Amino acid sequence: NVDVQKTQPRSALKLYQDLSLLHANELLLNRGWFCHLRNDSHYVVYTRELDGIDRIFIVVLNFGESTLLNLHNMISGLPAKMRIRLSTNSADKGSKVDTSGIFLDKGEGLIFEHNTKNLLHRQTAFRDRCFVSNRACYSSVLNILYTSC
Amino acid sequence: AESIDRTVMYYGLPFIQEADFPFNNYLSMLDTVSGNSVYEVITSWMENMPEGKWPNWMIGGPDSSRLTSRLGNQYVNVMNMLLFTLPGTPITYYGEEIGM
Amino acid sequence: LGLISGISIIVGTIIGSGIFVSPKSVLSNTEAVGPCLIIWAACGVLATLGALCFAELGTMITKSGGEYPYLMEAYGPIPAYLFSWASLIVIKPTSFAIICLSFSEYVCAPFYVGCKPPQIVVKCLAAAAILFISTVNSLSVRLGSYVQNIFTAAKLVIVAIIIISGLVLLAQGNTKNFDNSFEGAQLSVGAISLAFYNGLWAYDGWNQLNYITEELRNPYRNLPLAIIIGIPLVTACYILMNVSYFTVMTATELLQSQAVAVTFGDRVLYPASWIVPLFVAFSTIGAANGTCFTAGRLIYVAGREGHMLKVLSYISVRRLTPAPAIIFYGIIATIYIIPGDINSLVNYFSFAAWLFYGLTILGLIVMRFTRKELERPIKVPVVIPVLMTLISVFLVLAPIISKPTWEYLYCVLFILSGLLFYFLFVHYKFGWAQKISKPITMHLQMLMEVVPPEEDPE
Amino acid sequence: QPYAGMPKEVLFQFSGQARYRIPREILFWLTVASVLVLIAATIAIIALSPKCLDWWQEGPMYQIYPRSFKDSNKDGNGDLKGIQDKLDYITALNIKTVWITSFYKSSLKDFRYGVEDFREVDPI
Ligand SMILES: CCCCCCCCCCCCCCCCCC(=O)OC[C@H](COP(=O)(O)O)OC(=O)CCCCCCCCCCCCCCCCC
Numbered sequence: 001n002v003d004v005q006k007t008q009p010r011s012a013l014k015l016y017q018d019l020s021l022l023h024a025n026e027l028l029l030n031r032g033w034f035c036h037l038r039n040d041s042h043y044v045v046y047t048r049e050l051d052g053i054d055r056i057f058i059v060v061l062n063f064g065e066s067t068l069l070n071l072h073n074m075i076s077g078l079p080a081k082m083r084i085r086l087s088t089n090s091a092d093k094g095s096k097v098d099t100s101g102i103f104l105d106k107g108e109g110l111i112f113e114h115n116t117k118n119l120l121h122r123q124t125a126f127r128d129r130c131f132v133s134n135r136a137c138y139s140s141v142l143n144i145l146y147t148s149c
Numbered sequence: 150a151e152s153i154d155r156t157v158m159y160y161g162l163p164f165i166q167e168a169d170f171p172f173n174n175y176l177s178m179l180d181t182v183s184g185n186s187v188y189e190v191i192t193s194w195m196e197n198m199p200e201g202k203w204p205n206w207m208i209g210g211p212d213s214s215r216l217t218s219r220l221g222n223q224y225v226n227v228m229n230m231l232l233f234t235l236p237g238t239p240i241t242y243y244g245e246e247i248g249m
Numbered sequence: 250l251g252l253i254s255g256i257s258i259i260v261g262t263i264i265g266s267g268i269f270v271s272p273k274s275v276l277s278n279t280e281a282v283g284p285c286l287i288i289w290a291a292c293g294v295l296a297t298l299g300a301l302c303f304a305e306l307g308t309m310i311t312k313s314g315g316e317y318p319y320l321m322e323a324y325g326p327i328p329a330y331l332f333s334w335a336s337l338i339v340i341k342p343t344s345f346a347i348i349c350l351s352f353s354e355y356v357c358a359p360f361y362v363g364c365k366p367p368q369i370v371v372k373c374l375a376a377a378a379i380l381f382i383s384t385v386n387s388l389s390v391r392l393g394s395y396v397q398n399i400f401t402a403a404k405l406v407i408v409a410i411i412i413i414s415g416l417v418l419l420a421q422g423n424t425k426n427f428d429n430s431f432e433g434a435q436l437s438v439g440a441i442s443l444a445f446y447n448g449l450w451a452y453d454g455w456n457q458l459n460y461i462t463e464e465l466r467n468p469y470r471n472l473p474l475a476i477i478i479g480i481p482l483v484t485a486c487y488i489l490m491n492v493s494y495f496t497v498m499t500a501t502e503l504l505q506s507q508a509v510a511v512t513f514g515d516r517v518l519y520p521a522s523w524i525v526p527l528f529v530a531f532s533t534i535g536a537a538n539g540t541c542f543t544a545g546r547l548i549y550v551a552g553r554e555g556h557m558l559k560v561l562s563y564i565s566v567r568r569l570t571p572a573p574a575i576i577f578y579g580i581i582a583t584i585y586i587i588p589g590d591i592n593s594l595v596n597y598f599s600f601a602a603w604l605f606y607g608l609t610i611l612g613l614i615v616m617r618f619t620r621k622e623l624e625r626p627i628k629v630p631v632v633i634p635v636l637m638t639l640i641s642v643f644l645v646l647a648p649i650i651s652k653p654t655w656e657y658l659y660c661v662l663f664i665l666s667g668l669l670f671y672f673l674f675v676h677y678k679f680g681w682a683q684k685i686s687k688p689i690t691m692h693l694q695m696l697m698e699v700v701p702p703e704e705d706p707e
Numbered sequence: 708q709p710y711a712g713m714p715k716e717v718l719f720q721f722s723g724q725a726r727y728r729i730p731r732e733i734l735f736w737l738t739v740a741s742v743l744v745l746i747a748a749t750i751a752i753i754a755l756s757p758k759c760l761d762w763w764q765e766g767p768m769y770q771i772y773p774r775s776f777k778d779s780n781k782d783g784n785g786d787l788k789g790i791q792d793k794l795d796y797i798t799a800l801n802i803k804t805v806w807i808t809s810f811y812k813s814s815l816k817d818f819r820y821g822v823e824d825f826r827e828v829d830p831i
Pocket residue numbers: 383384385387388565567568572576580584689696697730731732734735738
């Protein structure tokens with residue numbers, strides 16, 4: 001029920017409230033590019049990107065049972081350790097996993113925030129799998145959005 | 150209960166206006182979930198809708214089975230994470246944020 | 250000028266750009282419609298009782314300046330010096346910055362229809378209006394007054410359109426937003442005192458009604474009668490413009506608005522919705538062109554006593570303009586808009602203005618015990634300057650006790666910075682003072698070709 | 708000689724020099740060129756700004772079956788008054804749009820909703 005899940009820090013209501021607040025405060029999630037990787041029998045990996053902002057969101061969602069993921073074989077240029085922004089198990093928020101071995105349980109999702117300047121929609125090997133509506137760049141100097149991409 | 154190429158006709162033409170989006174229930178029609186079947190729903194909407202249009206996503210509704218009874222208790226959190234990280238507008242049926 | 254053309258200059262002076270910016274910030278502090286209309290009426294009583302006290306001081310002393318000959322006659326040189334210092338660096342450039350910022354809110358709003366303009370566009374357009382007016386008034390002294398009468402005609406027309414079209418909608422039955430006008434409100438001393446800062450900005454000009462409306466057919470009777478008729482009649486036009494805003498907008502829609510009268514002209518005057526961003530933008534640079542006519546009048550009379558630099562209030566040889574004062578006001582007003590933000594420049598202005606309105610009206614009561622035998626032709630009853638000096642300490646102390654922000658520190662430190670310059674350049678004239686003041690005056694004289702004004706006190 | 712408060716007759720002997728004519732003409736023409744740049748920067752940003760998002764693109768929608776949300780008059784059915792008492796819960800979910808399904812005056816409340824009056828609310 002609603003009343004008991006407001007006092008539970010691991011409840012489904014608290015993850016929904018953290019996901020919808022993150023969606024409202026981040027330009028990457030409500031406006032940015034959607035670049036998906038290749039298909040897999042277990043997991044779904046995609047990125048949210050915007051040109052001008054120098055960080056990306058990496059969403060990793062396991063829809064099979066428990067598996068191990070090597071994220072170095074999907075996205076190039078990743079560090080040895082990545083910090084978790086949001087997880088479907090709320091105890092693992094702000095922790096650090098290693099990129100070569102990520103243990104995903106059955107029904108686990110992870111959101112990584114990665115500071116980089118190499119976006120996938122600018123690489124021609126990934127341009128066929130990237131999508132936008134209302135295309136715009138971001139100028140960090142002026143704090144505006146502009147269309148002259 | 151429609152093919153994907155007939156649903157995207159409600160988006161309209163680049164010079165004729167129509168609905169802002171047609172409602173997308175293709176994730177509500179999944180009775181079992183997998184990595185290939187979720188990839189097939191997401192990529193078929195993004196490839197078939199016209200460029201520059203706005204997508205939307207639903208995982209339930211009053212005519213669908215509820216999510217924790219359709220897929221299991223372990224998929225409540227990961228389908229809410231899928232709904233809020235996909236591009237477009239997420240649509241939430243009442244009680245899905247709790248897990249009814 | 251008779252009586253009827255005496256009250257027409259009062260209405261034309263007091264109607265300014267304030268009624269197009271202030272309704273958002275009065276409703277933002279008193280969150281209901283009912284208390285929002287009481288503050289708009291109580292501000293017109295403070296403007297009427299305030300202008301009556303200035304009417305007695307204007308006939309008793311009869312000297313040019315502003316409040317500067319009034320404070321010298323009551324307290325001496327030290328509050329007269331601090332008024333000349335605070336009107337140079339605080340009061341006059343902020344008034345030029347609020348008006349030019351209000352011009353750029355009304356040009357940029359119809360281009361960003363359902364969202365805000367970014368802060369870089371409203372500020373880079375406001376700086377282009379400061380530098381355009383500061384060069385036009387520094388070249389062509391008579392050009393500012395040919396266009397001045399068509400900028401006042403554009404102001405009264407767009408006020409009369411909003412009042413009349415709001416009374417038509419009020420007759421048809423669009424009165425739902427007035428139904429529960431007193432539910433959800435604030436009796437905090439910081440919510441009411443900042444609602445008075447924004448309402449009294451829309452009445453700006455009541456303290457300079459003395460100099461221009463005393464060349465009448467029968468003074469000492471028609472001057473206090475034009476104030477009792479003129480300023481309560483503009484108070485009726487300000488209440489009727491807020492009544493017109495609340496027929497087409499809810500109190501939540503008015504807070505979620507960039508310019509309040511563009512949103513009005515988008516719901517009433519539909520095929521001609523662009524006349525409200527056009528006429529308000531004409532009337533706002535006319536209110537900024539009008540404040541550059543007054544540049545140099547107080548600076549000349551304060552420099553005659555040694556309380557202000559004499560390189561200011563010099564006159565250009567070609568294009569006989571007060572060019573060092575207009576350029577000095579354009580520089581400080583451009584600095585003020587980089588932190589910017591109307592609702593943060595109005596608090597900065599009203600704190601220094603009402604500190605010296607309160608010292609001046611208190612000097613009317615001090616000069617009833619100290620400066621008798623002085624021929625007061627106008628003499629207001631004593632309860633009127635007592636109430637005006639009790640509200641003047643309520644409008645100073647209550648923001649700095651309940652809701653203290655950073656502008657009330659930067660305004661106090663800029664006024665007390667002048668109290669250091671009194672004790673080094675006026676009270677204790679040293680040796681190294683005039684050998685800084687004279688080479689600067691000499692080298693700025695050859696740069697701008699400006700001379701002393703071949704003149705007398707007047 | 709330039710002393711402090713030179714009249715017109717003494718000033719013209721020195722303001723025509725080279726070291727006071729060119730810093731006066733440069734600073735004037737760098738001011739009206741700063742006006743033309745600040746307007747050309749204002750028009751360039753307004754012309755290059757994107758159309759910002761509508762309300763139906765900004766936030767999530769929340770679909771409510773109104774008979775099963777909140778009963779307020781203790782008759783067993785959810786009503787529109789019960790939805791109004793729960794609007795603080797909906798804003799705490801960071802929801803933009805409320806979607807309410809069919810509440811028209813109906814004979815049939817399922818099977819795509821046979822409706823009796825399109826301009827009336829059903830009395831439950
Ligand atoms: C960062 C915070 C501080 C910022 C300070 C920024 C200072 C920038 C100065 C920019 C001045 C721009 C002037 C040009 C505006 C022209 C307006 C106009 O229409 O003119 C008509 C007028 C008519 O001339 P005509 O064209 O011959 O008819 O033209 C001029 O007068 C141009 C003369 C330029 C005046 C420059 C004044 C600068 C004074 C600086 C003094 C500094 C002394 C400090 C010493 C301290 C010692 C302790």
